Design a binder for this molecule. Structure first.
Ligand code: HEM
Ligand SMILES: [Mn+2]
Length: 291
C-alpha cells in the first residue's frame, strides 16, 4: 500500500503560504486564551489524530487520505471536540478548494503550532484524498489511562522512538482536557495558546497527586491547578522517558527542534515523496510577514 505525494496541480510555496495565512488570520480571529474551545489547539490535535491512525505495518490510516472528513473517523470517540477544528477549516477549504483534505488538516496543525510561537515545522504537500472505504476503523488512537509501556508500544506502530514520543507529548502544553470530550479535565499548564516546553517543567516541578476527576477517571493533579494524563505522567515514571523529559525541560530550543522533526514525521508517515517532489515548505508566520 503506497501513497505517493501528488502536488496539487501547479501549486507551490506561495499557494500554501496563502492557505497558512488564511488559517493563521482566522486563528487570530477565532482564538482567545480564555475560550473553552481552543481552535489552534484543535488544529494541532487534529493534525496529530489524522496522522496517529497510521499503522506502519500495512500503511493503513495516516494523514495522506484525509479520511477524517468521513463519518467513521469524524465520529471517532478519540476525535471528540475536533469537529470544531473541522468547522474552523471549512471556510478555509472553501476559499482554497484545491488543497487536499490531508494537506489542509495537516497544514492546520503546522500553522497553529507556528502561530502559537512554537517551532517552525517544515511541511510537505501532496496528500491526496482517498475514498471513504480507506477510512481507518476507530481505536487506533491512544488511550490516556495507560502506562509507559503502553505508550512506548503504542508509538512503535507509528514508528516513533522514545525521544520522538516524549517530544510529541510536549504539545500538551497547549490547551487542556475537556471532561465532555475525553473523560479528563484541566489544563496541562498555561493553557494560553502558547507553544512552550511547559509540559516538561510542570511534570518535573509540580506537586502531582493521583486523583479521580468528575468522570471517575484517574489523572494527576497539581496544586497549581494543572493536570497530567496517566500517559503523560508515564513519561516521568519510566526512567528512559524521564531522562528525555528532563532534557526538554532544560532546553527549550532542543525541545523545539525535536518536536519539529517528530511532528513533521508524524504528519508525513505513510507518505511516499517522489525524488522530484518539492522540498518541504517552511511557512512564515503572520508576525514574520507583518500581517
Ligand atoms: C499517548 C498519547 C496521547 C494521548 C493519550 C493523548 C490524549 C489527549 C487527551 C485525552 C486530550 C483532551 C481532548 C479533549 O478533552 O479535548 C488531549 C488533547 C490534546 N492533545 Fe493529546 N494525547 C496524546 C498525544 C498527543 C500528541 C502526540 C499530540 C500532538 C503532537 C497531542 C496534542 C494534543 C493537543 C494539542 C491537545 C489539547 C487540545 C485542547 O486544548 O483542545 N496529543 N490529548
Ligand atoms: Mn480545544
Amino acid at each position: 500500500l503506497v501513497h505517493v505525494a501528488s502536488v496539487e496541480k501547479g501549486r507551490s510555496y506561495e499557494d500554501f503560504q496563502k492557505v497558512y495565512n488564511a488559517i493563521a488570520l482566522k486563528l487570530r480571529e477565532d482564538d482567545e486564551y480564555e475560550n473553552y474551545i481552543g481552535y489552534g489547539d484543535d488544529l494541532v490535535r487534529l493534525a496529530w489524530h489524522i496522522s496517529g491512525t497510521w499503522d506502519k505495518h500495512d500503511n493503513t490510516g495516516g494523514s495522506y487520505g484525509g479520511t477524517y472528513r468521513f463519518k467513521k473517523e469524524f465520529n471517532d470517540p478519540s476525535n471528540a471536540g475536533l469537529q470544531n477544528g473541522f468547522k474552523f477549516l471549512e471556510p478555509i477549504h472553501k476559499e482554497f478548494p484545491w488543497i487536499s483534505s490531508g494537506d489542509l488538516f495537516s497544514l492546520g496543525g503546522v500553522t497553529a503550532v507556528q502561530e502559537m510561537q512554537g517551532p517552525k515545522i517544515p511541511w510537505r504537500c501532496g496528500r491526496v484524498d482517498t475514498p471513504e472505504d480507506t477510512t481507518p476503523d476507530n481505536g487506533r488512537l491512544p488511550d490516556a489511562d495507560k502506562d509507559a509501556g503502553y505508550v512506548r508500544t503504542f508509538f512503535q506502530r507509528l514508528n516513533m522512538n522514545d525521544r520522538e514520543v516524549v517530544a510529541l507529548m510536549g504539545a500538551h502544553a497547549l490547551g487542556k482536557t475537556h471532561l465532555k470530550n475525553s473523560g479528563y479535565e484541566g489544563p496541562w499548564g498555561a493553557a494560553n495558546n502558547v507553544f512552550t516546553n511547559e509540559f516538561y517543567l510542570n511534570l518535573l516541578n509540580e506537586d502531582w497527586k493521583l486523583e479521580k476527576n468528575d468522570a471517575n477517571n484517574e489523572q494527576w493533579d497539581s496544586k497549581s491547578g494543572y493536570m497530567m494524563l496517566p500517559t503523560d505522567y508515564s513519561l516521568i515514571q519510566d526512567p528512559k522517558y524521564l531522562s528525555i523529559v528532563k532534557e526538554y525541560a532544560n532546553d527549550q530550543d532542543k525541545f523545539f527542534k525535536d518536536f519539529s522533526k517528530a511532528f513533521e514525521k508524524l504528519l508525513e508517515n505513510g507518505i511516499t515523496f517522489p525524488k522530484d517532489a518539492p522540498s518541504p515548505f517552511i511557512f512564515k508566520t503572520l508576525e514574520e510577514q507583518g500581517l
